[PDB]
Amino acid sequence: SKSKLPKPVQDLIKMIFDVESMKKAMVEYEIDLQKMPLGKLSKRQIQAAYSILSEVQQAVSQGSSDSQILDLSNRFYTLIPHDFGMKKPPLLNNADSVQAKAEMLDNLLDIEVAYSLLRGGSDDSSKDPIDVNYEKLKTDIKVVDRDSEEAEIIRKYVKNTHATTHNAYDLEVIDIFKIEREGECQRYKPFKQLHNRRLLWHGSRTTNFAGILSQGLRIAPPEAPVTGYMFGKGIYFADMVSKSANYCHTSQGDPIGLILLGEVALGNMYELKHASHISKLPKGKHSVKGLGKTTPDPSANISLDGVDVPLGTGISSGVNDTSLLYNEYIVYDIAQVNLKYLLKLKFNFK
Ligand SMILES: NC(=O)c1cc(F)cc2[nH]c(-c3cc4c(s3)CCNC4)nc12
């Protein structure tokens, strides 16, 4: 309203700093907001909860001392307070359950970063809250024009890598933002020397984007479980928009999601057809490529700004005996990522 920014950037700001969305996420996790309000989330409590889920997972893998598991499960729920209403707390006693609680803590941490940013500052200004909260992201955000080559390439990227199989949605690009986080340029400069820099997708929940833009994509901490990281704790990317879009966790409820395009300096790829928890790459390798059954057609590889864009249609790869439908790319150093675009997408569920 009293803001200098174009309306798409303003709506982006409202969307990622939306306190109702934060509380709704907590309510949907069935968190007791009387015992743990949005405003009283702590990094230290969440780090301790991460550790417990790691111990839970260890206890599962060894051989359930069924009461020590229940003792760990109870300790988790004491630390992170829940209100399940009529049902009982679901026992944390398998991999899928540990992973869901870990995803919840990831979400909670970024929500806490968003809320601390929102309440931080002096809390009185001549400028309106949109411009002021825009500033706290430490990210220059510009609208890419629909009639530019970048918008066209990016829209083609979305079109061709929308996997018309197990897709319950058509995808529509509403806005394209060009983004530059403070310090990404200098942190990334050495890695610009690596060969094989690619423009790749990274999806995440909308309530995580205030944290992602202020802090960059991060690697899960040591305390957190490794369950569900097919290739260890790193930063994950796809060359198929629908693979990453699944990580937006968008529902028929909220059919709007945010997805990143990152330039990532892959270098020599450690190529793998099966899960393998990576803690250090072999010498000479700078990334992991999970080998999918379907890969973008290399004929239609193109470039913008010297970064390769694999927007080719999904064809067959020469890889039998793989656990993966689509490729994944993983780097283990945060400085190997340069976030270049942020898309607001509408999911049209069929
Ligand atoms: N975001 C992405 O675009 C993405 C793209 C991929 F090709 C593979 C991915 N794997 C993951 C994550 C795994 C886990 C998370 S995120 C939270 C904790 N439990 C495991 N994300 C991706």
Side-chain angles (χ1 to χ4, degrees), residues 1 3 5-42 46 48-57 59-63 66-69 72-87 89-90 92-122 125-126 128-161 163 168-169 171-191 194-251 253 255-279 281-292 294-319 321-349:
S1 172
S3 156
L5 300 163
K7 192 66 174 246
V9 177
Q10 310 195 6
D11 289 351
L12 179 68
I13 299 307
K14 282 185 280 209
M15 168 190 206
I16 67 199
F17 277 113
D18 184 292
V19 157
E20 182 204 314
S21 290
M22 307 183 195
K23 292 162 143 140
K24 197 184 170 228
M26 271 174 288
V27 168
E28 290 190 351
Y29 291 129
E30 313 199 63
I31 279 145
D32 190 325
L33 291 173
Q34 290 324 304
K35 307 207 201 68
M36 187 176 80
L38 167 57
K40 304 255 270 173
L41 292 164
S42 34
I46 296 177
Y50 268 138
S51 288
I52 295 156
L53 306 158
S54 282
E55 305 170 14
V56 170
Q57 177 57 87
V60 168
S61 288
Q62 303 173 239
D66 281 19
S67 323
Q68 197 208 324
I69 283 192
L72 294 170
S73 236
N74 269 61
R75 277 220 291 144
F76 179 82
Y77 286 124
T78 298
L79 192 54
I80 303 300
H82 285 71
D83 182 7
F84 300 109
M86 268 183 64
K87 43 214 189 164
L92 310 171
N93 72 344
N94 51 303
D96 273 355
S97 148
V98 167
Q99 188 176 339
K101 295 292 173 293
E103 277 140 15
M104 162 197 79
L105 295 175
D106 295 358
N107 196 10
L108 283 186
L109 258 169
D110 279 336
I111 279 160
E112 187 264 312
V113 164
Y115 199 60
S116 300
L117 280 185
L118 188 54
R119 303 232 87 218
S122 51
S125 202
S126 157
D128 71 317
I130 300 271
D131 280 3
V132 160
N133 294 300
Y134 170 80
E135 228 72 55
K136 314 186 194 184
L137 301 171
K138 305 304 185 188
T139 303
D140 182 83
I141 312 191
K142 287 171 177 58
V143 171
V144 178
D145 172 349
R146 179 132 33 195
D147 306 325
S148 71
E149 177 92 322
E150 312 149 86
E152 280 160 30
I153 295 171
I154 285 173
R155 279 196 167 85
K156 192 196 205 99
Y157 203 0
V158 169
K159 183 218 196 208
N160 288 353
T161 58
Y169 55 79
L171 228 45
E172 211 197 335
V173 176
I174 297 156
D175 302 313
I176 313 179
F177 304 95
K178 167 125 65 182
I179 58 166
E180 284 132 15
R181 284 201 332 108
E182 270 180 29
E184 200 149 275
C185 184
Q186 63 164 321
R187 168 183 103 174
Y188 182 73
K189 194 187 267 162
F191 295 92
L194 291 176
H195 298 203
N196 188 34
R197 302 177 320 275
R198 279 184 220 196
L199 194 66
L200 303 162
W201 298 106
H202 180 92
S204 193
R205 282 173 195 259
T206 294
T207 48
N208 292 337
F209 267 85
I212 288 171
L213 289 175
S214 90
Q215 295 179 338
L217 291 177
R218 287 204 172 166
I219 291 177
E223 316 82 280
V226 74
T227 323
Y229 288 112
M230 180 168 175
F231 295 106
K233 287 176 198 181
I235 307 173
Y236 281 65
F237 297 83
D239 59 21
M240 282 310 220
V241 68
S242 61
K243 189 162 188 165
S244 276
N246 300 332
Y247 292 88
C248 298
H249 297 111
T250 59
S251 38
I256 308 311
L258 302 177
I259 194 167
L260 292 155
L261 276 172
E263 183 196 345
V264 12
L266 294 168
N268 295 313
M269 292 172 312
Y270 192 28
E271 304 197 0
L272 298 176
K273 317 185 320 161
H274 303 289
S276 162
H277 291 2
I278 290 292
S279 184
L281 288 169
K283 218 127 201 172
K285 302 295 193 166
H286 283 264
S287 64
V288 166
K289 172 165 176 173
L291 293 177
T294 285
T295 179
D297 197 340
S299 323
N301 265 89
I302 65 92
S303 296
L304 61 137
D305 310 9
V307 188
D308 292 310
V309 184
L311 42 76
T313 324
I315 75 170
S316 166
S317 50
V319 188
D321 198 37
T322 174
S323 196
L324 282 174
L325 222 55
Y326 303 119
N327 301 323
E328 338 183 328
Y329 307 85
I330 299 87
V331 297
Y332 302 85
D333 185 334
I334 67 192
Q336 274 177 266
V337 180
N338 190 284
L339 298 186
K340 285 261 152 212
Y341 307 98
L342 174 63
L343 279 68
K344 173 177 159 166
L345 306 158
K346 176 154 163 276
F347 289 70
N348 289 310
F349 301 98

Short mmCIF file of all heavy atoms in Angstrom, two decimals, residues 50 98-100 102-104 106 201-204 217 220 225-230 234-241 243-249 259-260 326-330, ligand 1:
data_model
loop_
_atom_site.label_atom_id
_atom_site.label_comp_id
_atom_site.label_asym_id
_atom_site.label_seq_id
_atom_site.Cartn_x
_atom_site.Cartn_y
_atom_site.Cartn_z
N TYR A 50 15.47 -33.23 18.00
CA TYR A 50 16.20 -33.94 16.95
C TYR A 50 16.98 -35.12 17.53
O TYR A 50 16.90 -36.24 17.02
CB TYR A 50 17.16 -33.00 16.25
CG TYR A 50 16.62 -32.30 15.03
CD1 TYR A 50 16.90 -30.96 14.81
CD2 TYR A 50 15.88 -32.98 14.08
CE1 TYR A 50 16.44 -30.31 13.71
CE2 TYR A 50 15.40 -32.33 12.95
CZ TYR A 50 15.70 -30.98 12.78
OH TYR A 50 15.27 -30.29 11.68
N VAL A 98 9.54 -41.66 12.37
CA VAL A 98 10.65 -40.78 12.74
C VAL A 98 10.85 -39.69 11.69
O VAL A 98 11.11 -38.53 12.01
CB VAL A 98 11.94 -41.61 12.94
CG1 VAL A 98 13.17 -40.71 13.00
CG2 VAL A 98 11.85 -42.46 14.20
N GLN A 99 10.73 -40.07 10.41
CA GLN A 99 10.96 -39.11 9.34
C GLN A 99 9.92 -37.99 9.36
O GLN A 99 10.27 -36.81 9.19
CB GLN A 99 10.97 -39.84 8.00
CG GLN A 99 11.39 -39.01 6.83
CD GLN A 99 11.48 -39.81 5.54
OE1 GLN A 99 11.60 -41.05 5.55
NE2 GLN A 99 11.41 -39.11 4.41
N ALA A 100 8.64 -38.33 9.61
CA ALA A 100 7.58 -37.32 9.68
C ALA A 100 7.82 -36.34 10.83
O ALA A 100 7.59 -35.14 10.67
CB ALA A 100 6.21 -37.99 9.84
N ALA A 102 10.77 -35.61 12.04
CA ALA A 102 11.94 -34.82 11.66
C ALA A 102 11.56 -33.71 10.70
O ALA A 102 11.98 -32.56 10.86
CB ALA A 102 13.00 -35.73 11.04
N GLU A 103 10.75 -34.04 9.69
CA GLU A 103 10.22 -33.01 8.80
C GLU A 103 9.50 -31.93 9.58
O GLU A 103 9.69 -30.73 9.32
CB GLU A 103 9.32 -33.65 7.73
CG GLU A 103 10.13 -34.20 6.55
CD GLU A 103 9.66 -35.55 5.99
OE1 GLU A 103 8.53 -35.99 6.29
OE2 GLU A 103 10.47 -36.15 5.22
N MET A 104 8.73 -32.32 10.60
CA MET A 104 8.04 -31.33 11.43
C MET A 104 9.02 -30.38 12.10
O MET A 104 8.80 -29.16 12.12
CB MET A 104 7.16 -32.00 12.48
CG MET A 104 6.80 -31.03 13.58
SD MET A 104 6.19 -31.79 15.07
CE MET A 104 7.72 -32.32 15.81
N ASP A 106 12.23 -29.63 11.18
CA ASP A 106 12.72 -28.76 10.11
C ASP A 106 11.76 -27.58 9.92
O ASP A 106 12.17 -26.41 9.97
CB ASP A 106 12.82 -29.52 8.78
CG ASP A 106 13.84 -30.64 8.78
OD1 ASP A 106 14.54 -30.85 9.79
OD2 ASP A 106 13.91 -31.35 7.75
N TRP A 201 16.02 -27.68 -9.62
CA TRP A 201 14.88 -27.36 -8.78
C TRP A 201 15.14 -27.73 -7.32
O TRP A 201 15.85 -28.69 -7.03
CB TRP A 201 13.65 -28.13 -9.26
CG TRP A 201 13.23 -27.80 -10.65
CD1 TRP A 201 13.38 -28.57 -11.76
CD2 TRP A 201 12.54 -26.62 -11.07
NE1 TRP A 201 12.86 -27.93 -12.86
CE2 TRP A 201 12.32 -26.73 -12.46
CE3 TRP A 201 12.08 -25.47 -10.40
CZ2 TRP A 201 11.66 -25.76 -13.19
CZ3 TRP A 201 11.43 -24.49 -11.14
CH2 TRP A 201 11.23 -24.64 -12.52
N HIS A 202 14.51 -26.98 -6.41
CA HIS A 202 14.47 -27.35 -4.99
C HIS A 202 13.15 -26.86 -4.41
O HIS A 202 12.95 -25.65 -4.26
CB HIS A 202 15.64 -26.76 -4.20
CG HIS A 202 15.60 -27.13 -2.75
ND1 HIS A 202 16.25 -28.25 -2.25
CD2 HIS A 202 14.95 -26.57 -1.70
CE1 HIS A 202 16.01 -28.35 -0.95
NE2 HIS A 202 15.22 -27.35 -0.60
N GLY A 203 12.27 -27.79 -4.04
CA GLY A 203 11.00 -27.43 -3.42
C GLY A 203 11.09 -27.43 -1.91
O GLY A 203 11.93 -28.11 -1.31
N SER A 204 10.21 -26.64 -1.28
CA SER A 204 10.10 -26.60 0.18
C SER A 204 8.76 -25.98 0.53
O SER A 204 8.12 -25.31 -0.29
CB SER A 204 11.26 -25.80 0.81
OG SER A 204 11.33 -26.01 2.21
N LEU A 217 19.78 -22.30 1.62
CA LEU A 217 19.54 -23.72 1.84
C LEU A 217 20.63 -24.27 2.75
O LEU A 217 21.82 -23.95 2.58
CB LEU A 217 19.52 -24.47 0.52
CG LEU A 217 18.34 -24.19 -0.42
CD1 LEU A 217 18.56 -24.97 -1.70
CD2 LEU A 217 16.99 -24.58 0.24
N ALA A 220 20.99 -30.50 6.95
CA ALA A 220 20.44 -30.95 8.22
C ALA A 220 21.56 -31.06 9.26
O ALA A 220 22.68 -31.46 8.92
CB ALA A 220 19.75 -32.31 8.07
N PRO A 225 17.95 -36.99 12.51
CA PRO A 225 18.04 -38.31 11.86
C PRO A 225 18.51 -38.19 10.42
O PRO A 225 18.30 -37.18 9.75
CB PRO A 225 16.60 -38.83 11.91
CG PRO A 225 15.94 -38.04 12.99
CD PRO A 225 16.61 -36.71 13.03
N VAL A 226 19.15 -39.26 9.94
CA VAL A 226 19.48 -39.41 8.52
C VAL A 226 18.38 -40.13 7.74
O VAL A 226 18.44 -40.19 6.50
CB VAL A 226 20.85 -40.13 8.36
CG1 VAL A 226 20.73 -41.64 8.68
CG2 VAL A 226 21.46 -39.89 6.98
N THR A 227 17.35 -40.64 8.42
CA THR A 227 16.22 -41.31 7.77
C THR A 227 15.55 -40.41 6.73
O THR A 227 15.13 -39.29 7.02
CB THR A 227 15.17 -41.72 8.80
OG1 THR A 227 15.81 -42.16 10.00
CG2 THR A 227 14.27 -42.82 8.24
N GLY A 228 15.40 -40.94 5.51
CA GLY A 228 14.79 -40.21 4.44
C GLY A 228 15.73 -39.39 3.60
O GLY A 228 15.31 -38.84 2.57
N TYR A 229 17.00 -39.26 4.00
CA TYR A 229 18.02 -38.67 3.14
C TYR A 229 18.68 -39.82 2.41
O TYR A 229 19.61 -40.45 2.90
CB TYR A 229 19.02 -37.86 3.95
CG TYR A 229 18.46 -36.55 4.48
CD1 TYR A 229 18.27 -36.37 5.84
CD2 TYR A 229 18.12 -35.51 3.62
CE1 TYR A 229 17.78 -35.19 6.35
CE2 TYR A 229 17.63 -34.29 4.13
CZ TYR A 229 17.46 -34.16 5.50
OH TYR A 229 16.97 -33.00 6.06
N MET A 230 18.17 -40.11 1.21
CA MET A 230 18.63 -41.25 0.44
C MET A 230 20.14 -41.25 0.24
O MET A 230 20.75 -42.32 0.07
CB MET A 230 17.92 -41.26 -0.90
CG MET A 230 18.31 -42.40 -1.78
SD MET A 230 17.20 -42.51 -3.18
CE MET A 230 17.97 -43.83 -4.10
N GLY A 234 22.75 -33.64 2.96
CA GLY A 234 23.25 -32.66 2.01
C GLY A 234 22.11 -31.78 1.55
O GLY A 234 21.05 -31.77 2.19
N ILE A 235 22.30 -31.07 0.44
CA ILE A 235 21.29 -30.22 -0.17
C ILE A 235 20.86 -30.87 -1.47
O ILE A 235 21.70 -31.17 -2.33
CB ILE A 235 21.83 -28.80 -0.42
CG1 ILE A 235 22.42 -28.23 0.87
CG2 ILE A 235 20.70 -27.90 -0.96
CD1 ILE A 235 23.11 -26.92 0.70
N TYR A 236 19.56 -31.08 -1.63
CA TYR A 236 19.04 -31.96 -2.67
C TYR A 236 18.40 -31.15 -3.79
O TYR A 236 17.72 -30.16 -3.53
CB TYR A 236 18.02 -32.94 -2.09
CG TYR A 236 18.64 -34.11 -1.36
CD1 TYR A 236 19.37 -33.93 -0.19
CD2 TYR A 236 18.47 -35.41 -1.83
CE1 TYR A 236 19.93 -35.03 0.48
CE2 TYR A 236 19.01 -36.49 -1.18
CZ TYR A 236 19.74 -36.29 -0.02
OH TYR A 236 20.27 -37.39 0.61
N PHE A 237 18.59 -31.60 -5.04
CA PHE A 237 18.00 -30.93 -6.19
C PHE A 237 17.51 -31.96 -7.19
O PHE A 237 18.00 -33.09 -7.23
CB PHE A 237 18.99 -30.00 -6.91
CG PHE A 237 19.48 -28.87 -6.06
CD1 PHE A 237 20.53 -29.06 -5.18
CD2 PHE A 237 18.89 -27.61 -6.15
CE1 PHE A 237 21.00 -28.01 -4.40
CE2 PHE A 237 19.34 -26.56 -5.37
CZ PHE A 237 20.38 -26.75 -4.49
N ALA A 238 16.55 -31.54 -8.03
CA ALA A 238 16.02 -32.37 -9.10
C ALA A 238 16.11 -31.62 -10.43
O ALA A 238 16.18 -30.39 -10.47
CB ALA A 238 14.56 -32.77 -8.81
N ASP A 239 16.11 -32.38 -11.53
CA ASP A 239 16.03 -31.79 -12.86
C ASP A 239 14.64 -31.99 -13.47
O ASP A 239 14.43 -31.70 -14.65
CB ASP A 239 17.12 -32.37 -13.79
CG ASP A 239 17.04 -33.90 -13.96
OD1 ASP A 239 15.97 -34.49 -13.73
OD2 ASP A 239 18.07 -34.52 -14.32
N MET A 240 13.70 -32.47 -12.66
CA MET A 240 12.31 -32.72 -13.00
C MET A 240 11.47 -31.91 -12.02
O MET A 240 11.52 -32.16 -10.82
CB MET A 240 11.97 -34.22 -12.85
CG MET A 240 12.45 -35.16 -13.98
SD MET A 240 12.00 -34.59 -15.63
CE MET A 240 11.56 -36.10 -16.44
N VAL A 241 10.70 -30.93 -12.53
CA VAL A 241 10.06 -29.99 -11.60
C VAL A 241 9.10 -30.73 -10.67
O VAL A 241 8.95 -30.35 -9.50
CB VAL A 241 9.34 -28.85 -12.36
CG1 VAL A 241 8.11 -29.37 -13.14
CG2 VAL A 241 8.91 -27.76 -11.39
N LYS A 243 9.37 -33.71 -9.37
CA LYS A 243 10.06 -34.32 -8.23
C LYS A 243 10.21 -33.32 -7.09
O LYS A 243 9.89 -33.62 -5.94
CB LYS A 243 11.42 -34.86 -8.66
CG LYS A 243 12.08 -35.70 -7.56
CD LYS A 243 13.20 -36.60 -8.10
CE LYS A 243 13.71 -37.56 -7.02
NZ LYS A 243 14.54 -38.69 -7.57
N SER A 244 10.70 -32.11 -7.40
CA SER A 244 10.92 -31.14 -6.34
C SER A 244 9.60 -30.58 -5.83
O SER A 244 9.49 -30.26 -4.64
CB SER A 244 11.82 -30.02 -6.83
OG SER A 244 13.18 -30.39 -6.71
N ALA A 245 8.60 -30.45 -6.72
CA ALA A 245 7.32 -29.88 -6.33
C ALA A 245 6.65 -30.71 -5.25
O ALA A 245 5.96 -30.17 -4.39
CB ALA A 245 6.40 -29.76 -7.55
N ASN A 246 6.88 -32.03 -5.24
CA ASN A 246 6.35 -32.84 -4.15
C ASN A 246 6.85 -32.36 -2.80
O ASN A 246 6.15 -32.51 -1.79
CB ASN A 246 6.74 -34.30 -4.37
CG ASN A 246 6.17 -34.85 -5.68
OD1 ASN A 246 5.12 -34.39 -6.16
ND2 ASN A 246 6.85 -35.85 -6.24
N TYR A 247 8.03 -31.76 -2.74
CA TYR A 247 8.53 -31.27 -1.47
C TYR A 247 7.95 -29.90 -1.09
O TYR A 247 8.30 -29.37 -0.04
CB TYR A 247 10.06 -31.25 -1.49
CG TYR A 247 10.63 -32.66 -1.53
CD1 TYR A 247 10.84 -33.31 -2.75
CD2 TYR A 247 10.91 -33.37 -0.36
CE1 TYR A 247 11.35 -34.60 -2.81
CE2 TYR A 247 11.41 -34.68 -0.41
CZ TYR A 247 11.62 -35.28 -1.64
OH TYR A 247 12.11 -36.55 -1.72
N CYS A 248 7.04 -29.35 -1.90
CA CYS A 248 6.31 -28.16 -1.46
C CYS A 248 5.17 -28.51 -0.51
O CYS A 248 4.65 -27.61 0.15
CB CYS A 248 5.75 -27.41 -2.66
SG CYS A 248 7.00 -26.78 -3.80
N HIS A 249 4.79 -29.78 -0.43
CA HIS A 249 3.68 -30.24 0.40
C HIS A 249 2.44 -29.36 0.22
O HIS A 249 1.81 -28.92 1.17
CB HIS A 249 4.10 -30.32 1.87
CG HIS A 249 5.20 -31.32 2.13
ND1 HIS A 249 6.48 -30.94 2.49
CD2 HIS A 249 5.21 -32.67 2.07
CE1 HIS A 249 7.23 -32.02 2.63
NE2 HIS A 249 6.49 -33.08 2.39
N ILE A 259 8.86 -22.66 -5.29
CA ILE A 259 9.92 -23.57 -5.67
C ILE A 259 11.13 -22.76 -6.10
O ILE A 259 10.99 -21.67 -6.68
CB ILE A 259 9.44 -24.53 -6.77
CG1 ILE A 259 10.41 -25.69 -6.93
CG2 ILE A 259 9.25 -23.77 -8.09
CD1 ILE A 259 9.80 -26.79 -7.78
N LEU A 260 12.33 -23.25 -5.78
CA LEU A 260 13.56 -22.54 -6.14
C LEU A 260 14.16 -23.11 -7.40
O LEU A 260 14.05 -24.30 -7.69
CB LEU A 260 14.60 -22.63 -5.03
CG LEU A 260 14.18 -21.85 -3.78
CD1 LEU A 260 14.88 -22.45 -2.57
CD2 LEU A 260 14.45 -20.36 -3.95
N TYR A 326 13.42 -40.64 -11.07
CA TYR A 326 14.07 -39.47 -11.64
C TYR A 326 15.41 -39.22 -10.97
O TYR A 326 15.65 -39.63 -9.84
CB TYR A 326 13.16 -38.23 -11.52
CG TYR A 326 11.83 -38.46 -12.17
CD1 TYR A 326 10.65 -38.40 -11.43
CD2 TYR A 326 11.75 -38.79 -13.52
CE1 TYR A 326 9.41 -38.63 -12.04
CE2 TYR A 326 10.53 -39.03 -14.13
CZ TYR A 326 9.36 -38.95 -13.39
OH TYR A 326 8.16 -39.19 -14.02
N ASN A 327 16.30 -38.52 -11.69
CA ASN A 327 17.59 -38.12 -11.14
C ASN A 327 17.39 -37.29 -9.87
O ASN A 327 16.38 -36.63 -9.69
CB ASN A 327 18.39 -37.29 -12.14
CG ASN A 327 18.67 -38.02 -13.45
OD1 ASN A 327 18.91 -39.22 -13.47
ND2 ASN A 327 18.65 -37.26 -14.56
N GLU A 328 18.39 -37.34 -8.99
CA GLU A 328 18.58 -36.35 -7.93
C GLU A 328 20.05 -35.95 -7.93
O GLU A 328 20.92 -36.74 -8.29
CB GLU A 328 18.22 -36.86 -6.51
CG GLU A 328 17.29 -38.04 -6.42
CD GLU A 328 16.94 -38.43 -4.97
OE1 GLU A 328 17.79 -38.26 -4.07
OE2 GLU A 328 15.82 -38.92 -4.75
N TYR A 329 20.32 -34.73 -7.49
CA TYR A 329 21.67 -34.18 -7.37
C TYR A 329 21.85 -33.67 -5.95
O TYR A 329 20.97 -32.99 -5.41
CB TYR A 329 21.89 -33.04 -8.37
CG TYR A 329 21.57 -33.40 -9.79
CD1 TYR A 329 20.27 -33.31 -10.28
CD2 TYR A 329 22.58 -33.81 -10.67
CE1 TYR A 329 19.96 -33.65 -11.58
CE2 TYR A 329 22.29 -34.15 -11.98
CZ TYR A 329 20.98 -34.07 -12.44
OH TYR A 329 20.68 -34.40 -13.74
N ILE A 330 22.99 -33.98 -5.33
CA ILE A 330 23.23 -33.65 -3.93
C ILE A 330 24.61 -33.03 -3.82
O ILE A 330 25.58 -33.57 -4.35
CB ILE A 330 23.14 -34.88 -3.00
CG1 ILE A 330 21.75 -35.53 -3.04
CG2 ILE A 330 23.40 -34.45 -1.58
CD1 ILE A 330 21.55 -36.58 -4.14
N1 LIG B 1 13.53 -30.37 -1.81
C1 LIG B 1 13.79 -30.95 -3.14
O1 LIG B 1 13.54 -30.30 -4.13
C2 LIG B 1 14.32 -32.39 -3.26
C3 LIG B 1 14.60 -32.90 -4.50
C4 LIG B 1 15.06 -34.24 -4.63
F1 LIG B 1 15.32 -34.73 -5.91
C5 LIG B 1 15.25 -35.06 -3.49
C6 LIG B 1 14.96 -34.54 -2.20
N2 LIG B 1 15.03 -35.04 -0.95
C7 LIG B 1 14.67 -34.07 -0.07
C8 LIG B 1 14.50 -34.19 1.34
C9 LIG B 1 14.60 -35.35 2.11
C10 LIG B 1 14.27 -35.19 3.47
C11 LIG B 1 13.88 -33.94 3.82
S1 LIG B 1 13.93 -32.98 2.39
C12 LIG B 1 13.51 -33.56 5.22
C13 LIG B 1 13.97 -34.62 6.26
N3 LIG B 1 13.76 -35.97 5.81
C14 LIG B 1 14.33 -36.30 4.51
N4 LIG B 1 14.32 -32.97 -0.76
C15 LIG B 1 14.50 -33.20 -2.09
#
